[PDB]
Design a protein around this ligand. Sequence first.
Ligand SMILES: CN(C)[C@H]1CCc2ccccc2C1
Ligand SMILES: [Mg+2]
Ligand SMILES: [Mg+2]
Ligand SMILES: [Mg+2]
Length: 332
Amino acid sequence: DIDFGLPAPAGISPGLEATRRHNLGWVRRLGLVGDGPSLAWYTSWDMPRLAACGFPHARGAALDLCADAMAFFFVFDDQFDGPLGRDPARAARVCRRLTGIVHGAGPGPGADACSAAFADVWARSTDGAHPGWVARTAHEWEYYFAAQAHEAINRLRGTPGDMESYLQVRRGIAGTDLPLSLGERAAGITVPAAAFHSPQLRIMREAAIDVTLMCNDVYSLEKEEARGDMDNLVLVIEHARRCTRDEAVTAARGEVARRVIRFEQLAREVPALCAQLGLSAVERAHVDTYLGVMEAWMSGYHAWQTQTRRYTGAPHVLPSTGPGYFDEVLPT
Ligand SMILES: CN(C)[C@H]1CCc2ccccc2C1
Ligand SMILES: [Mg+2]
Ligand SMILES: [Mg+2]
Ligand SMILES: [Mg+2]
């Protein structure tokens, strides 16, 4: 009964079905997903539809990379729904292993499934990419991995943070701007740095990422609250404001809506901004596609989460009385 006012997706990638086939083989081949309950549970998430709705510009092997990257995010995420997420030092050490892969230390044969899957996603991501994209996205991955242990610290504390501290942890553990870096890469575009760092596009990028993680906070609250998770916008608002759950959900909707309004107000300025910078027609085309990538990510993430089984299913198939996975795939 919660709708954030986002438009339905203007399009879906035509590669959904082909990518479903690729990604099913990929998660099994890497050892990221097993057979039986884990495979049925993974399948019920519909990672291919997340990729096709979230990245409608992606075609062919580009959409495959989007789905595999999402597969890594979601499988790796769930490994912390258990003792690992209550052990910050252990989480930090595991995440340092993954961070070493970001910065050039490939894992080698026989690495664990999470290390091997990440290394494959990261190698495919950087192949042929602009060095400015590689440097930025490498730092985005570092933030994602490094933030996990702080979520665990907050779990042990047992109170939500203030809004500023919530944003610092939650933006990291949500994957920071990685979905947009992935969408840019999958669309085959390179945002000119002069446009990328405009105040309008910097604010818009931040707003779009906040929109999707906050939409997720509302839909994933039931499975997260029961596990003692603290970095969820609804819990943060309730704790800060001393309000009811309904009032906190309504306020969370408002945090999303005001960011969508800001994004759309600034998007109106993007044609003029490109003219002021004297960008070439091709540069302007890449900026226009970047705008579409951001718009499609916001609408597509939400379209996916309304139809997936991940959020309605989790409390029943992986109750909070046990770990949030059927198989351990991340050695700690
Ligand atoms: C690590 N989490 C599984 C993240 C992965 C990326 C993402 C992007 C937007 C909204 C929610 C999420 C869940
Ligand atoms: Mg999670
Ligand atoms: Mg998480
Ligand atoms: Mg969530």
